[PDB]
Amino acid sequence: ALGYVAFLERKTQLAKAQSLLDRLFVLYPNCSIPPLVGKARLLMQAEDWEQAIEVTHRILAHDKSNVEALALEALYAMAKDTRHDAAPVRVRRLLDAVRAKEPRNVALLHQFALVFSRLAGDRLDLLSLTTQFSDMAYALDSRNGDVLCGLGYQQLYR
């Protein structure tokens, strides 16, 4: 159904797309992550970010230790919430989870390093944390020159 979800999300037939989502995590709450993040995916695609973080908190209820839940929350601290300044501690919570969740992935983590730092900006408390994101990207590989590029982009913002 996710292919049909992707089919309807591309077509922006979100009335039938979201109905497919709502009959996905209700019928399949055991899987939880694919449809509920998928609803949280669609909600911010329909720009319903205030709903998406509430879904994320519901996802956090099922499992707080999900990086995708902690990324969505840290995304909402950057997307819509005008209550930032606690965010460096909030993204640190996400920063701890990414330390243990992917100690194998070079390609995803390099993009994860440059993306989530570019969310933050010139906030040095964020910049101190988000550079450590590029540290693990540097930890797994450095011969791929994009790794020092994203870290250098942080050093560009440093």
> Which residues have C-beta within 8 Å of that of residue 33, sequence separation ≥ 6?
59, 66, 68
Angstrom resolution of this structure:
3.5
- Within 10 A of 139 (CB to CB), how many other CB atoms are there? 12
d(CA 150, CA 130): 11
d(CA 50, CA 44): 9
d(CA 158, CA 145): 19
Experimental technique used?
Answer: cryo-EM
> Long-range contacts for 5-14 (Cβ within 8 Å, ≥24 apart)?
5/38, 5/42, 9/41, 9/42, 9/45, 14/42, 14/45, 14/46
d(CA 56, CA 46): 16
Quick one: which H or E segment has residue 61? helix 49-62
Going along 10-150, which residue ranges are E strands?
none
HSE toward the beta carbon, residue 32, CA cutoff 13 A: 13
d(CA 3, CA 24): 13
